[PDB]
Amino acid sequence: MRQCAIYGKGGIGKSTTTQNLVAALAEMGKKVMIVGCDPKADSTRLILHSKAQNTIMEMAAEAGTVEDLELEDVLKAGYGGVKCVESGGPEPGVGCAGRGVITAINFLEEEGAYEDDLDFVFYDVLGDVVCGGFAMPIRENKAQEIYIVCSGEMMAMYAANNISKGIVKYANSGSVRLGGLICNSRNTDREDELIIALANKLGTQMIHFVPRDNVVQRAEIRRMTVIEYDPKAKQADEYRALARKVVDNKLLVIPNPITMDELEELLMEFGIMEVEDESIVGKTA
């Protein structure tokens, strides 16, 4: 069983890419489980055709304690037999993402959910502020092959750099490694070139460039993946290509994070960021 995680910031389609990748793996005959660890996204909605899946945190509070929770109420099967679980985001004002994911993983391990025919587990993790809590899957050596979803924009690339810093922090134990960057296109010129250049500086690869295509939203509105909604679409073949490359990937590395100066240099080289006129700084009109 390969223990994987998809990390990335919010608002760039990370969870839609994760679920479409997972659907492509199931189509290939792989047994997969998704464990949602992103308080800002529905990590399983497209596999289950659901509005919202009951979370481990919510159900544990409904049954009093996680000790009296039944696996059947938290683990659901959807398209292609993919098994789906949601951890539950932190209780507002009180919770910590690190505590929630420890609780979910310990529960699934005690109930034998990882023992199956399982070929892959994917943790879908919010990777923006890479604090100790959201890095808990790394610290606990559960997210062993990490793929970072990003886009050719400053905040998404900054997040990729901070996720890489988190991987570096734990390099002296366990075996957590970076497997590559996935570029979720935003229809920006030279975006593919930019993420390839970032991957090169980080010491990894851009494993796939995911195009923007209206069929993604046509499937999302029906609460499904493209693989299920229209397996003949061009975009379905894009997710199949990504899935094949993930299955076959042996290029797992400890990355080399960059400085903010180096990041700004990349954004300028590829036309995203304009040069700063230091001569007008502080000058009124």
Residue 280 interaction partner, one of its own copies, ligand SF4, none, beta carbon < 5-8 Å per kind: its own copies
Residue (250 or 279) nearer to its own copies, CB: 279
Please select the residue that binds its own copies; options are 133, 152, 180, 255, rule is CB under 8 A. Answer: 133
Active-site annotation holds for 283: no
Stretch that binds ligand SF4, among 5-13, 14-22, 125-133, 184-192 (CB under 6 A): 125-133
* Residue showing the smallest CB distance to ligand SF4 in the complex: 133
Interaction of residue 280 with its own copies, rule CB under 8 A: yes
DSSP the chain: -EEEEEEE-TTSSHHHHHHHHHHHHHHTT--EEEEEE-TTS-SSHHHHT-S-PPPHHHHHHHTSSGGG--GGGT-EE-GGG-EEEE--PPPTTT--HHHHHHHHHHHHHHTTSSSSS--EEEEEEE-SS--TTTTHHHHTT---EEEEEE-SSHHHHHHHHHHHHHHHHTTTSS--EEEEEEEE--S-TTHHHHHHHHHHHHTS-EEEEE---HHHHHHHHTT--HHHH-TTSHHHHHHHHHHHHHHH----B------HHHHHHHHHHTTSSPPP-TTSTT---
Q: Is 52 in the site for its own copies (CB under 8 A)?
A: yes
Instruction: Give whichever of 32 and 159 is closer to ligand SF4, judged by the CB atom.
Output: 159
The residue with tokens 């890419």 is 17
Active site (annotated) includes residue 30:
no
Q: How many chain residues interact with its own copies (CB under 8 A)?
A: 51
**Per rule CB under 8 A, is residue 168 in the interface with its own copies?**
yes
CA–CA distance from 189 to each of 4, 205, 215, 229 (Å)? 31, 20, 21, 29
- For residues 186 to 225, the per-residue mask of contacts with its own copies, x marking binding by CB under 8 A and - elsewhere, is --------------------------------x--xxxx-
Is residue 12 a known part of a binding site?
Answer: yes
Shortest Å, Cβ 154 to ligand SF4: 22
**In the complex, minimum distance from the CB of residue 15 to its own copies, in angstroms, rounded to a whole number:** 13
Bridge partners of 76, per DSSP, are: 84
Query: At a CB cut-off of 8 Å and minimum separation 6, what does 243 contact?
Result: 21, 24, 25, 27, 28
| 128 noted as active-site residue | yes
98 binds ligand SF4 (CB under 6 A): yes
Amino acid at 1: M
What is the footprint of its own copies within residues 137-166 (CB under 8 A)? 138-139, 155, 158, 162-163, 165-166
**Nearest CB to its own copies, comparing residues 9 and 208:** 9
Per the residue annotation, which of 38, 83, 128, 142 is the catalytic one? 128
Both structure tokens of 201: 């500086």
Residue ranges in contact with its own copies by CB under 8 A: 10-11, 39-40, 49, 52, 89-90, 92-97, 126, 128-133, 135, 138-139, 155, 158, 162-163, 165-170, 218, 221-224, 228-230, 260, 276-277, 280-285
Give catalytic residues, as residue numbers: 9, 14, 40, 128
Residue ranges in contact with ligand SF4 by CB under 6 A: 96-98, 131-133
